[PDB]
Ligand binder design. Structure first.
Ligand code: CDL
Ligand code: U10
Ligand code: PC1
Ligand code: PC1
Ligand code: PC1
Ligand code: 3PE
Ligand code: 3PE
Ligand code: 3PE
Ligand code: 3PE
Ligand code: PLC
Ligand code: PLC
Ligand code: SF4
Lengths: 70, 318, 98, 51, 83, 96, 115, 99, 175, 155, 114
């Protein structure tokens, strides 16, 4: 019957799901649980390279709030 | 963690391609009142695995009249470039986030044509040559129409960034405002992927096997893998362009599930179409896209340049 | 004048010397004309992009537009040469004597 | 001023039209079958093709 | 008006793709010259601040220039918030 | 629908650009000190490296004018490590 | 760095698959096996002979129209200008002339393949 | 221009792209805007014969900005000297020049 | 080192030029111009122009695809020449690479070379600008000005492409 | 142990080859009609993994379905030669087995086995679509019992 | 010709504003309303003087006023502000659209307490 075609689609669907899921989870792991910073224009890149210096650990995804001003 | 990301892209792609071959044979089977693979594994789930092993332990031959360096470069180029057209695709986060992703895919799709031209020419065979020159005619047919169809859609998005197409379709799919452009785009992806009814570079019933008539064993598998990785990619592109999916930054998996289903359905439509229609003559494909799609695409291109201006709906640049 | 300008200017000279030394095929010489346009495009794009000459950024595009016209024009002549002799050899183009 | 080099030169045609060259059209001959899906198995259709 | 209607029907019966092409293109050229919203497209583009608004040295004789961003003077984007 | 959503997208863009316009005075002030600090560090190090060269004048200008000329990448990162030179030159173009 | 590493991985995987294809299997090479394929009978001539292109005129026209995409693709950015009246005029003028070129070739039988 | 139809008719056909210090989209400046402006203003209305000698200072600075020949020579000497000292163990680079 | 990526791409750019300048079969010459177009896109793309680099690659990919079809129709022989089959082709190929080697050898050793012009071997990165742009791409803003500023350029190019179609039909009519 | 490993590798490649047989699209006479019915929905050879492909360079099996004449014999050998190995031949029908109804003709080859090696002989005139399918499943069992690697291991 | 004059490292010493880009963008709209005068003073100096060496003193008052701005947020609106810029910091594009509920809490605290 036709529903015997579904197992081949489920396997194919699981394979198409992994690339998107893996990139989403790997980005979270590499940016401290946040989205990877998108820098399409120099202003955004300028802010990302300023985040590295402010973090004090050479990482742009380490945020510093009001606890770092006094 | 970036190398793991690359492998978590190409390896699943090669697995999806492997089981798309199973899915096509079973979907073609049931539309033809039969079953398709159901013996090798439960419901044919091991058929792709049996075919991969068979092809890579079979003898590959270099024809005595072939140009070896180009004969072997062509299959490498085909698969290397079919995997390279996935890196900018947002699902919902691209592996490589490009500001001109739409341009990049256009450029790579034009370079992947030469995996056909050099394959067919290097084989030094008449049927491979006739197949190669049908890829020249096919590219001349759809290239102009394809690029201007993309441009018309991008005039409602405002950028060449693929991830921006997610924001553009946050309220509504672009299939509604651009259904005439979606029709022509869909046909142009059939022509661009050498799929029926535009499977002319191979043209089994005319050229035996066309541009890859002389290829055997693993080298042939690379062309087959490249062919099937492109149709999935060209349908992921279509889902992003015209069937946008909502992106919740806290549930990036919900996007992937919904986006994956639409891509599967569009891919199924490729198989649905291959079972329903005859094959165009390759001179009739040229007249289809130059005398029907190009006049309409040019008109719609003017319409979509003016419509945002006269409605005060020009999209933001960033 | 960085070390990149050396290679780009050498590419133009190679394609110029390639265009001035015909072997047999008119098509082989047409490729050298398209090669020279590529060098000029790259050299102009580099200078304009490096100096932040914003409005000049369209000049390289206008340079490709008229490179295609010449390339198409050269191909159209190659069709008629081929139709008259069955090849694109330049040695057949000698009916006119200086 | 005749010389040895220009001994075989002859004046051009009175209307600038040279005779067309001897027909050298090279049609491409192809075996369409027998081992061909559309040849019904045992047909060897030898075709002269132009393009 | 009878012979012209014959031409339209003839083309609509033999080249429906071209009839749609010319009709679509005709609207692209005509509607912008008529739409009252075309002027707002120009204003929105001019209202997008790509550059920094360099301040003017105050010589004491610029009554129409605001001293602070939230002053009443200067251009207003109230129209855009309702458009 | 498309033109109503695009119109909203233009207002969200103006808000985003005004956020930058509020910060640019602070960013510009920081950048000026950062560029001047780097140039001085190269000057304090050109003195030691070029102390023995006969005719060298430390900090000499290649220009006739005394106007401020924006340093190019080589002047600013002339002596720094290749790791930071690579990010300052191709960092943006390569960030994808 | 990421893009270059992504390209190296894709073409390294493609290359390694080809290498395995030629070195894993058992080979038995002889003359008849590697002869060119022409449905069972020996080819009558060389595959390197001239192959007439009946769509040569349309192929030249593709070169000219393929340069219109370069001129038309900047339109999304062009629409951001403050000179919309001028921009929209030249956008439509450029597309229209591209259409007149198509009309001229179509009417003059330029898109018909040679016999 | 051989025939100056532009100047008489008051139409600007191609003058808008002749120099890099002219009006640019979004007021984006060129890297050598100041140098070009000075050379253009120095040599305005005095002819190229005079400008070739009386505005030689501005034009040499303008060429220095364009091609940076003298700056790169200066950087080369400093870099070359530093290697010679380091090659013979006579100079220790500071931390901020290494990390 | 990746700091010399632009220089390394420009060496391939020359090598591709020697590929088709030595003039083998136009099939292999077309391949050489594709490699140069690909690396030429890379070189331009590293100076801040992504549209220009991707565009020239896009135009030359379609340009050599028409040339490929024209090579199998009008520029083919029984034994297409490769860079090794002919002394004239091989001689010009080896000569081109040797000159490229010497120029590359001297520039990376002396950091300078004097041929017509004076070239500097410190690296292409020393001439880049140290300031950032705003929220836009300067190359994209300049290219988009063709329609607002380049009214005269659009007319002449538009007319040239129109006449280009008229001319090619006239040249190839044959009667 | 090394004998155990080569035995399992042999079972793997043997499985892959018998599960992915690709016959060449090659039929000569009436027997090819019965070969079409084996691809028709009732028997559906595709469900066993048997897929026709036209190019001899992508085929694993040659089914000589019909009469082989002296004129066609050189063509058959050529296409057989152009098959990459391993390659198996199935002879279908009386004509392809030993000449059949035309054994005593001036123009008929008395058996395809005079031109190529044959692995399975399928009798009948024509064999029913279900009798050809028996020969294909008999060929698969023959491949299942190959000892290529085991024989190599003790050379 | 001539020696390029540079400030000493003591002339460039100032108390930096060590807050990430998400903190600055969250407070940008209020920051540009309160610190306008020292900001616009410094920005006029750069465009008129065209030399960063001539606007160091103005550039320090930009830093001084930005610190006092954040100190006032740290005294009254510490908690609402932290939630606001944490939610802006989560997005790759640092979008304002996705933090309206948290923006409202930050806007109402400053309106009442400042
Ligand atoms: C983009 C990358 C382009 C790659 C270069 C173009 C392809 C090669 C080619 O066209 O040569 C044709 C031409 C024809 O030679 P042929 O293939 O032997 O003729 C076929 C006969 O039938 C001869 O038949 P045969 O019986 O002799 O064939 C037997 C041979 C056959 O085995 C092979 O064919 C070798 C396998 C080639 C693999 C090609 C794929 C490359 C890797 C994938 C990269 C994908 C992109 C990433 O098997 C062997 O025994 C191998 C050992 C003998 C050496 C074989 C010749 C190697 C030539 C170098 C190839 C590279 O080769 C040459 O004349 C060599 C000249 C140098 C060519 C390179 C320079 C071209 C200029 C443009 C490139 C600019 C530089 C950019 C590259 C450098 C980057 C750092
Ligand atoms: C009546 O008169 C006569 C004729 O007139 C008709 C004749 O003709 C003839 C001559 C006869 C013949 C030559 C034989 C005729 C026999 C027939 C069966 C033809 C009848 C009609 C058919 C429709 C039969 C089959 C044809 C079609 C088109 C059916 C379509 C279905 C298919 C399954 C075909 C292929 C389809 C698909 C979707 C692809 C499957 C292909 C594969 C190669 C398998 C997958 C591919 C791979 C490369 C493997 C996958 C995995 C990889 C590559 C690895 C990935 C994973 C990794 C980890 C790397 C005679 C004598 C005659 O008397
Ligand atoms: C975790 C860190 C780590 O793993 O090392 C990366 C390391 C370290 O991680 P990182 O530096 O990339 O990221 C930083 C990580 N945190 C956030 C924790 C600081 O990165 C590298 O140095 C480069 C890695 C080189 C390649 C690593 C091997 C890749 C091949 C793995 C084979 C298995 C793939 C399986 C694929 C399955 C497909 C279906
Ligand atoms: C065949 C094997 C080669 C595969 C084909 C590669 C073609 C060139 C790839 C161009 C990449 C590109 O467009 O940039 C995308 C994008 C451009 O789009 P973008 O606008 O998003 O730019 C990204 C940068 N920001 C974030 C600032 C916007 O660039 C990148 O992703 C990073 C740039 C890295 C540049 C490295 C280039 C070196 C490799 C060039 C190889 C050239 C040889 C090609 C030969 C082909 C002929 C065989
Ligand atoms: C006739 C042959 C050609 C056929 C081509 C078209 C075939 C593919 C058509 C896909 C139609 C949508 C498939 C519905 C199943 C997917 C479910 C899903 O995406 O989420 C629910 C989606 C809603 O999820 P969403 O993410 O798409 O959001 C809707 C769109 N925006 C973002 C604007 C709000 O709704 C449906 O698709 C219901 C149908
Ligand atoms: C029966 C008919 C079949 C028809 C064919 C259907 C096609 C296949 C369907 C598409 C493929 C889906 C396969 C995966 C579905 C389940 C995935 C999932 O939701 O997992 C939970 C998800 C995150 O989980 P995940 O990241 O994938 O794994 C952990 C990795 N560290 O986190 C979440 O909770 C996200 C919310 C999930 C809601 C569901
Ligand atoms: C203000 C700026 C905008 C204006 C720009 C000015 C340029 C406009 C044209 C641009 C497009 C180029 C093509 C124009 C020519 C149309 C094509 C053509 O040449 O047709 C010739 C046609 C040849 O066909 P034939 O072999 O003779 O057989 C059919 C005979 N009836 O022979 C024929 O029979 C044709 C009969 C006449 C066809 C008239 C076509 C008019 C097209 C413009 C209509 C636009 C308005 C329509 C839309 C209204 C708004 C909704
Ligand atoms: C420094 C620049 C010159 C480098 C040397 C380049 C010459 C390389 C050798 C060469 O090109 O071939 C020698 C050439 C004859 O070559 P060939 O094509 O075989 O002539 C007879 C063909 N029937 O004979 C020549 O014309 C060489 C002239 C020098
Ligand atoms: C070894 C080649 C060589 O050194 O020839 C140099 C020769 C003299 O020129 P020049 O270098 O200016 O005088 C000596 C100054 N030391 O000059 C030459 O003969 C070099 C030949 C150059 C051919 C130029 C052809 C026209 C293209 C001009 C574009 C600029 C090309 C020069 C830069 C490329 C250098 C690789
Ligand atoms: C057919 C080939 C034509 C000739 C090509 C040149 C070959 C000889 C090079 C010797 C020069 C040398 O000794 O320099 C070696 C350099 C290494 O790279 P670098 O970045 O300069 O590293 C050195 C500088 N460090 C230490 C600061 C990092 O090589 C090149 O960059 C050559 C270009 C790449 C080769 C083409 C791909
Ligand atoms: C890239 C570099 C490639 C290197 C070469 C790789 C191929 C050759 C390796 C053979 C090594 C060897 O010796 O295996 C052979 C040995 C026994 O040796 P023997 O009986 O003395 O052989 C002497 C010669 N005979 C045999 C002709 C008499 O059998 C074994 O135990 C295992 C053999 C099978 C391979 C096991 C690997 C399983 C991988 C599974 C993947 C899915
Ligand atoms: S064996 Fe019988 S059915 Fe088959 S070809 Fe011969 S006569 Fe026909």
């Amino acid at each position: 019957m036709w529903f015997e075609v579904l197992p081949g689609i489920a396997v194919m669907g699981v394979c198409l799901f992994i690339p998107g899921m893996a990139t989403a989870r790997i980005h979270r792991f590499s940016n401290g649980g946040k989205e990877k910073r998108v820098a399409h224009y120099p202003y955004q890149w300028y802010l990302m390279e300023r985040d590295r210096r402010v973090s004090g650990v050479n990482r742009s995804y380490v945020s510093k709030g009001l606890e770092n001003i006094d | 963690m970036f190398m793991i990301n690359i492998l978590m892209l190409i390896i699943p792609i090669l697995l999806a391609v492997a089981f798309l071959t199973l899915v096509e044979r079973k979907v073609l089977g049931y539309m033809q009142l039969r079953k398709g693979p159901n013996v090798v594994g439960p419901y044919g789930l091991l058929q792709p695995i049996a075919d991969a092993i068979k092809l890579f332990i079979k003898e590959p031959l270099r024809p005595a009249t072939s140009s070896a360096s180009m004969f072997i470069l062509a299959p490498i180029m085909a698969l290397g470039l079919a995997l390279t057209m996935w890196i900018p695709l947002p699902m919902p986060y691209p592996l490589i986030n490009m500001n001109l992703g739409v341009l990049f895919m256009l450029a790579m799709s034009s370079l992947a044509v030469y995996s056909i031209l050099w394959s067919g020419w290097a084989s030094n065979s008449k049927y491979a040559l006739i197949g190669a020159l049908r890829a020249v005619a096919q590219t001349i047919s759809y290239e102009v129409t394809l690029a201007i169809i993309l441009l018309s859609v991008l005039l409602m998005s405002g950028s060449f960034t693929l991830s921006t197409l997610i924001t553009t379709q946050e309220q509504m799919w672009l299939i509604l405002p651009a259904w005439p452009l979606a029709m022509m785009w869909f046909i142009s992806t059939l022509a661009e992927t050498n799929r029926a009814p535009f499977d002319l570079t191979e043209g089994e019933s005319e050229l035996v096997s066309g541009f890859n008539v002389e290829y055997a064993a693993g080298p042939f598998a690379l062309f087959f893998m490249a062919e099937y990785a492109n149709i999935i990619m060209m349908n992921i592109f279509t889902a992003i362009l015209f069937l946008g999916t909502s992106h919740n930054p806290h549930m990036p998996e919900l996007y992937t599930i919904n986006f994956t289903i639409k891509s599967l359905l569009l891919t199924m439509s490729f198989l649905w179409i291959r079972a329903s229609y005859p094959r165009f003559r390759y001179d009739q494909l040229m007249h289809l896209l130059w005398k029907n799609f190009l006049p309409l695409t040019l008109a719609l291109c003017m319409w979509h340049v003016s419509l945002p201006i006269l409605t005060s709906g020009i999209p933001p640049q960033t | 004048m960085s070390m990149v300008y050396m290679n780009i200017m050498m590419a133009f000279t190679v394609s110029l010397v390639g265009l001035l030394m015909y072997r047999s095929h008119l098509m082989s010489s047409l490729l050298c004309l398209e090669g020279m346009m590529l060098s000029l495009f790259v050299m102009a794009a580099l200078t304009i992009l490096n100096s932040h000459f914003t409005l000049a950024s369209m000049m390289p595009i206008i340079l490709l537009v008229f490179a295609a016209c010449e390339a198409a024009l050269g191909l159209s002549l190659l069709v008629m040469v081929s139709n008259t002799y069955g090849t694109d050899y330049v040695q057949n183009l000698n009916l006119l004597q200086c | 001023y005749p010389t040895k080099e220009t001994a075989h030169w002859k004046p051009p045609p009175w209307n600038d039209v040279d005779p067309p060259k001897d027909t050298l059209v090279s049609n491409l001959t192809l075996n369409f079958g027998p081992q061909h899906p559309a040849a019904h198995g045992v047909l060897r259709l030898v075709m002269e093709l132009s393009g | 008006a009878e012979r012209v209607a014959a031409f339209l029907k003839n083309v609509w019966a033999k080249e429906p793709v071209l009839v749609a092409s010319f009709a679509i293109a005709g609207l692209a050229v005509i509607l912008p010259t008529l739409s009252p919203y075309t002027k707002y497209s120009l204003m929105i583009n001019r209202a997008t601040p790509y550059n920094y608004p360099v301040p003017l040295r105050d010589d004491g004789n610029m009554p129409d220039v605001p001293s602070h961003p939230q002053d009443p003077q200067g251009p207003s984007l109230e129209w855009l918030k309702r458009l | 629908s498309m033109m109503k959503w695009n119109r909203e997208r233009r207002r969200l863009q103006i808000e985003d650009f005004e956020a930058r316009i509020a910060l640019m005075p602070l960013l510009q002030a920081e950048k000026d000190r950062r560029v001047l600090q780097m140039l001085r560090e190269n000057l304090e190090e050109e003195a030691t490296v070029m102390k023995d060269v006969p005719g060298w004048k430390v900090g000499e200008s290649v220009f006739h004018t005394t106007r401020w000329v924006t340093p190019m990448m080589g002047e600013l990162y002339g002596l720094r490590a290749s790791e930071e030179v690579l990010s300052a030159t191709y960092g943006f173009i390569w960030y994808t | 760095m990421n893009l270059m590493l992504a390209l190296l991985t894709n073409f390294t995987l493609a290359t390694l698959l080809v290498i395995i294809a030629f070195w894993l299997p058992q080979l038995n090479v002889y003359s008849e096996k590697t002869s060119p394929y022409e449905c069972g009978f020996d080819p009558m001539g060389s595959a390197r002979l001239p192959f007439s292109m009946k769509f040569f005129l349309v192929a030249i026209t593709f070169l000219l129209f393929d340069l219109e995409i370069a001129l038309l693709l900047p339109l999304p950015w062009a629409s951001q200008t403050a000179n919309l009246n001028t921009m929209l005029t030249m956008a439509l003028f450029l597309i229209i002339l591209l259409a007149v070129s198509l009309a001229y070739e179509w009417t003059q039988k330029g898109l018909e393949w040679t016999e | 221009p051989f025939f100056d139809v532009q100047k008489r008719l008051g139409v600007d056909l191609d003058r808008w792209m002749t120099i890099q210090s002219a009006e640019q989209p979004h007021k984006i400046p060129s890297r050598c805007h100041a140098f070009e402006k000075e050379w253009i203003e120095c040599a305005h209305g005095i002819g190229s014969i005079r400008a070739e000698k009386e505005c030689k200072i501005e034009f040499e600075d303008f060429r220095e900005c364009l091609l940076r020949q003298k700056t790169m020579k200066r950087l080369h000497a400093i870099r070359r000297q530093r290697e010679k000292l380091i090659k013979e163990g006579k100079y220790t680079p500071p931390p901020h020049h290494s990390g | 080192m990746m700091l010399y990526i632009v220089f390394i791409l420009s060496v391939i750019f020359v090598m591709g030029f020697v590929g088709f300048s030595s003039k083998p079969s136009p099939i292999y010459g077309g391949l050489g111009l594709i490699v140069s177009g690909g690396v030429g896109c890379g070189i331009v793309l590293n100076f801040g122009g992504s549209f220009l680099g991707l565009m020239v690659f896009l135009i030359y990919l379609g340009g050599m695809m028409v040339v490929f079809g024209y090579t199998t129709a009008m520029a083919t022989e029984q034994y297409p020449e490769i860079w090794l089959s002919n002394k004239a082709v091989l001689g010009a190929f080896v000569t081109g690479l040797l000159m490229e080697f010497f120029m590359v050898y001297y520039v990376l050793k002396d950091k300078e070379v004097e041929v017509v012009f004076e070239f500097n071997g410190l690296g292409d990165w020393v001439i880049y600008d140290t300031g950032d742009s705003g929220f836009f791409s300067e190359e994209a803003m300049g290219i988009a000005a063709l329609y607002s500023y380049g009214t005269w350029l659009v007319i002449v190019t538009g007319w040239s492409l129109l006449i280009g179609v008229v001319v090619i039909m006239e040249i190839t009519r044959g009667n | 142990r090394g004998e155990y490993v080569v035995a399992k590798l042999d079972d793997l490649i043997n499985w892959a080859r018998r599960s992915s047989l690709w016959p060449m699209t090659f039929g000569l006479a009436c027997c090819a009609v019965e070969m079409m019915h084996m691809a028709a929905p009732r028997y559906d050879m595709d469900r066993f993994g048997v897929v026709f492909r036209a190019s001899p360079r992508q085929s694993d099996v040659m089914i000589v379905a019909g009469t082989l004449t002296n004129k066609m014999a050189p063509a058959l050998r050529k296409v057989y030669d152009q098959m990459p190995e391993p390659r198996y031949v199935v002879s279908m029908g009386s004509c392809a087995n030993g000449g059949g109804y035309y054994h005593y003709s001036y123009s008929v080859v008395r058996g395809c086995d005079r031109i190529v090696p044959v692995d399975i002989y399928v009798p009948g005139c024509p064999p029913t679509a279900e009798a050809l399918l028996y020969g294909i499943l008999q060929l698969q069992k023959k491949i299942k019992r190959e000892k290529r690697l085991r024989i190599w291991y003790r050379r | 010709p001539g020696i390029v004059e540079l400030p000493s490292l003591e002339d460039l010493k100032v108390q930096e504003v060590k807050v990430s880009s998400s903190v600055l963008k969250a407070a940008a709209h209020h920051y540009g309303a309160q610190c306008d005068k020292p900001n616009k003073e410094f920005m006029l100096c750069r465009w008129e003087e065209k030399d960063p060496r001539r606007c160091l003193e103005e550039g320090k008052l930009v830093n001084q006023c930005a610190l006092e701005f954040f100190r006032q947020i740290k005294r009254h609106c510490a908690e609402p502000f932290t939630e606001y810029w944490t939610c802006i910091d989560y997005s790759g594009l640092q979008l304002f659209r996705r933090c309206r509920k948290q923006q409202a809490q930050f806007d109402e605290c400053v309106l009442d307490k400042l």
